[PDB]
Design an enzyme around this catalytic site. Sequence first.
Site, PDB file in Angstrom:
ATOM      1  N   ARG A 124     -12.571 -22.928  -8.091  1.00  0.00           N
ATOM      2  CA  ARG A 124     -11.429 -23.800  -7.735  1.00  0.00           C
ATOM      3  C   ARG A 124     -10.166 -23.428  -8.518  1.00  0.00           C
ATOM      4  O   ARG A 124      -9.046 -23.754  -8.111  1.00  0.00           O
ATOM      5  CB  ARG A 124     -11.774 -25.278  -7.990  1.00  0.00           C
ATOM      6  N   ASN A 125     -10.361 -22.737  -9.638  1.00  0.00           N
ATOM      7  CA  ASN A 125      -9.295 -22.460 -10.593  1.00  0.00           C
ATOM      8  C   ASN A 125      -8.798 -21.018 -10.601  1.00  0.00           C
ATOM      9  O   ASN A 125      -7.988 -20.639 -11.443  1.00  0.00           O
ATOM     10  CB  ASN A 125      -9.718 -22.923 -11.987  1.00  0.00           C
TER      11      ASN A 125
ATOM     12  N   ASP B 111     -11.759 -23.748 -18.611  1.00  0.00           N
ATOM     13  CA  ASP B 111     -12.017 -24.336 -17.293  1.00  0.00           C
ATOM     14  C   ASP B 111     -12.131 -23.299 -16.171  1.00  0.00           C
ATOM     15  O   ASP B 111     -11.582 -23.472 -15.083  1.00  0.00           O
ATOM     16  CB  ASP B 111     -10.964 -25.416 -16.953  1.00  0.00           C
TER      17      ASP B 111
ATOM     18  N   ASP C 264      -4.855 -21.500 -13.415  1.00  0.00           N
ATOM     19  CA  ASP C 264      -5.141 -22.773 -14.069  1.00  0.00           C
ATOM     20  C   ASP C 264      -5.178 -22.643 -15.588  1.00  0.00           C
ATOM     21  O   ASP C 264      -6.117 -23.097 -16.234  1.00  0.00           O
ATOM     22  CB  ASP C 264      -6.460 -23.367 -13.542  1.00  0.00           C
TER      23      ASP C 264
HETATM   24  C1  LIG Z   1      -1.220 -21.738  -0.745  1.00  0.00           C
HETATM   25  O1  LIG Z   1      -1.081 -22.963  -1.483  1.00  0.00           O
HETATM   26  C2  LIG Z   1      -0.884 -22.864  -2.838  1.00  0.00           C
HETATM   27  C3  LIG Z   1      -1.159 -23.985  -3.623  1.00  0.00           C
HETATM   28  N1  LIG Z   1      -0.986 -23.969  -4.939  1.00  0.00           N
HETATM   29  C4  LIG Z   1      -0.538 -22.874  -5.572  1.00  0.00           C
HETATM   30  C5  LIG Z   1      -0.373 -22.892  -6.954  1.00  0.00           C
HETATM   31  N2  LIG Z   1      -0.661 -24.014  -7.632  1.00  0.00           N
HETATM   32  C6  LIG Z   1      -0.624 -24.105  -9.106  1.00  0.00           C
HETATM   33  C7  LIG Z   1      -1.897 -23.508  -9.721  1.00  0.00           C
HETATM   34  N3  LIG Z   1      -2.013 -22.690 -10.771  1.00  0.00           N
HETATM   35  N4  LIG Z   1      -3.209 -22.420 -10.969  1.00  0.00           N
HETATM   36  C8  LIG Z   1      -3.999 -23.023 -10.082  1.00  0.00           C
HETATM   37  C9  LIG Z   1      -5.376 -23.037  -9.882  1.00  0.00           C
HETATM   38  C10 LIG Z   1      -5.861 -23.795  -8.825  1.00  0.00           C
HETATM   39  C11 LIG Z   1      -4.949 -24.491  -8.026  1.00  0.00           C
HETATM   40  C12 LIG Z   1      -5.398 -25.276  -6.968  1.00  0.00           C
HETATM   41  C13 LIG Z   1      -6.647 -25.598  -6.607  1.00  0.00           C
HETATM   42  C14 LIG Z   1      -6.706 -26.412  -5.531  1.00  0.00           C
HETATM   43  C15 LIG Z   1      -8.035 -26.895  -4.948  1.00  0.00           C
HETATM   44  N5  LIG Z   1      -5.536 -26.773  -4.986  1.00  0.00           N
HETATM   45  S1  LIG Z   1      -4.347 -26.056  -5.894  1.00  0.00           S
HETATM   46  N6  LIG Z   1      -3.626 -24.428  -8.291  1.00  0.00           N
HETATM   47  N7  LIG Z   1      -3.175 -23.755  -9.229  1.00  0.00           N
HETATM   48  C16 LIG Z   1       0.095 -21.733  -7.581  1.00  0.00           C
HETATM   49  C17 LIG Z   1       0.370 -20.603  -6.808  1.00  0.00           C
HETATM   50  N8  LIG Z   1       0.201 -20.616  -5.490  1.00  0.00           N
HETATM   51  C18 LIG Z   1      -0.240 -21.715  -4.850  1.00  0.00           C
HETATM   52  C19 LIG Z   1      -0.417 -21.707  -3.465  1.00  0.00           C
END
Ligand SMILES: COc1cnc2c(NCc3nnc4ccc(-c5cc(C)ns5)nn34)ccnc2c1
Length: 286
Positions: free
Chosen positions: A148-149, A144, A162
């Site tokens: 976005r990821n 994936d 992701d």
């Molecule tokens: C600054 O805000 C954030 C939000 N989410 C995460 C976050 N979320 C878990 C995660 N792990 N891999 C991914 C890949 C993409 C995303 C996101 C993608 C979108 C559109 N919102 S969160 N989140 N994510 C991890 C680390 N830092 C972050 C900081």
Amino acid sequence: HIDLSALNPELVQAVQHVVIGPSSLIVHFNEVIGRGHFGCVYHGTLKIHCAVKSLNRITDIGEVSQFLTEGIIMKDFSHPNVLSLLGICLRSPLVVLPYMKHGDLRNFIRNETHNPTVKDLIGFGLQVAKGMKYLASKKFVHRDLAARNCMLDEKFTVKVADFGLARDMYDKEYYSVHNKTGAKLPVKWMALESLQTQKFTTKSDVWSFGVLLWELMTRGAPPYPDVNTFDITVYLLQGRRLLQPEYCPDPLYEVMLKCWHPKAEMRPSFSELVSRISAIFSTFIG
Ligand SMILES: COc1cnc2c(NCc3nnc4ccc(-c5cc(C)ns5)nn34)ccnc2c1
């Protein structure tokens, strides 16, 4: 509960290094910083700043032994362009990840606040390629890869994210339900053969990477907007590819076309992509 006996005996020692003691983590449940299908993510304090992902939106976690194994495998991954796992906290377990200040790559490049140059954008692409080179050397297929990821930290270091315990659908719009299998697929990022077979390979990751490069050069435009979901196969088979963005250098478009080669085995390795893109990157100033 941790059943150490249930684990692969080879991995028992690694448990102490992945498990976060509940008294070591403060999670700020009042503000959601990210939303996935499987759960929300919050600010956390470990004093280091972290992101804490909940998995409570899924009805069930599955085998606890498998969950730990996943965590253990993921924690051993270490590369500056790959999101690391800090650990797992057992309160449904919480996934603890380094905090990525500037969020996901797609939103970052769409953001009117920042002004990345063409060189910066190619550089983001190069960083993704290096992360994928690492992942592919570990025989890991992402499945994936998309803008976005991937995420950016405080110093704008891009990291492939992701995956493993961080795997989710973070933007529901770009996932379509398959008729026969029911699987929710990122069809506009998928290689022709994957759309046909639902088998994912490193070479289908390379196809996804080509689309990611296109996203960067259009500063986060949606790919194939006038195509509807699974009709993408018909569209591609007509003899079509995403068009060259205005500010995409010709050799970078040639790289994208190579990534979308009809024959999976003819697509460039991530090592070749690193080399080719580093060359193109070096030609720019600013
Ligand atoms: C600054 O805000 C954030 C939000 N989410 C995460 C976050 N979320 C878990 C995660 N792990 N891999 C991914 C890949 C993409 C995303 C996101 C993608 C979108 C559109 N919102 S969160 N989140 N994510 C991890 C680390 N830092 C972050 C900081």
